[PDB]
Amino acid sequence: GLIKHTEYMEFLKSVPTFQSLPEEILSKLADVLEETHYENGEYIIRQGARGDTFFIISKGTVNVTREDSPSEDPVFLRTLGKGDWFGEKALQGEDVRTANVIAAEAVTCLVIDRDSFKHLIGGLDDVSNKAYEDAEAKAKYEAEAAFFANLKLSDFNIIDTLGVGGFGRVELVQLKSEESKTFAMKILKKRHIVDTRQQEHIRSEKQIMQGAHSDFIVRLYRTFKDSKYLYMLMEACLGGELWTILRDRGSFEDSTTRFYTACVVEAFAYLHSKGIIYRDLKPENLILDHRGYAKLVDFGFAKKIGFGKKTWTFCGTPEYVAPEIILNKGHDISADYWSLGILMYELLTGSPPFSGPDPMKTYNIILRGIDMIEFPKKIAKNAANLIKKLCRDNPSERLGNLKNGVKDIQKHKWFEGFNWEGLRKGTLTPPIIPSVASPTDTSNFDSFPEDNDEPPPDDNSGWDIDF
Ligand SMILES: Cc1cc(C(=O)O)ccc1CN1CCC[C@H](O[C@H](CO)c2cc(Cl)cc(Cl)c2)[C@@H]1c1ccccc1
């Protein structure tokens, strides 16, 4: 009873899932856990039964089967041993069982019912309850992956084209099996990737977007591949493209730009907190969802940088490249803060502050700096103030790369009256509200014809291995 608790505790510290949890949770768990015993061949659980109990194996092995029809043989799935657990769906509500768990020898479980677990979750506020939800969140993303891992391209159907370029195209795809589920599939010609030397830009794009979990960034759920293309299954943001909205409107009203800048500012708070530099900011990298909220799409130039490290790769559209990138000194996260001031200037006027007749001449007016620019009368004093602070030459002096970091940009006079929590909570009313009738409604995108041309060559070189 009192010494039982000391073994239950040392056993939970051996299980990889639980061992990392706080001792408050683990000792509280060791008090409530009841030890149940089974014999070889005994059904610990039966498919189709209703239950409220979760199991952890402390001794023995179990075989999990699942019969798919009365007049069909059973289907063996897996064998679970000591440290492994099952029945978990029973704790988070749903009590119906989907597979049989049979004892493959003498088995000993440590069992806990649904009530006993819910009653147990009452504990140390932002110490232990905080730490519990972090693991649950992390564990929710591995569950997500396995749902998508079972899928094939054959499980989707194409609705309409969302974008078409040299790369290939973006297509709205519907999950055949659940028609309410639609995604933005980005099909990419492997030849193009190869011809442009982008095998590593595309490998990182995958790694980052799948790793990212922000409401200001487009979700990349998984990837697919064939002999000719790469397929990136992403969340469908049906609000429309930001560059097609700016095109149609010319410029954006002061308060409209504030909302889209704020969305970017949160994306950058998230990305910079994980040591990732974005680089490719421009209106073609922002997409609104059905609500009218903007998300960062395209992580081609994005990079994972070491704490205290810089990069040297000269890249990006000339109009948006920072002085330290052109001058080939080092560049870091603060390069993204230069991009915010460019985006701002363009959204308010329809064009960026620096552009020449070729890349070289564009680079010559960029190194002259924001202080030489005669800001249009349409830019407000507060907006201009922020652009001049964001686009300073020395990256060390740049707003966002100071003491409070991103908070210094959130605290600017331009954001006086801006509900930053409303935006994060998702309760802030956006400036332009898209009309989206259903998941298949592509009415806020342009119409592109179907590709008539022949498919690109096959490429089985093996760089695509990870996809
Ligand atoms: C895979 C998964 C999916 C979801 C979801 O999609 O809702 C949530 C959590 C999990 C992870 N999830 C699976 C069952 C075992 C385990 O959850 C159960 C029930 O939440 C649990 C049982 C015990 Cl006795 C102790 C703990 Cl801390 C948690 C695990 C988990 C580990 C640490 C912290 C929280 C949760």
Ligand SMILES: [Cl-]
């Ligand atoms: Cl997420």
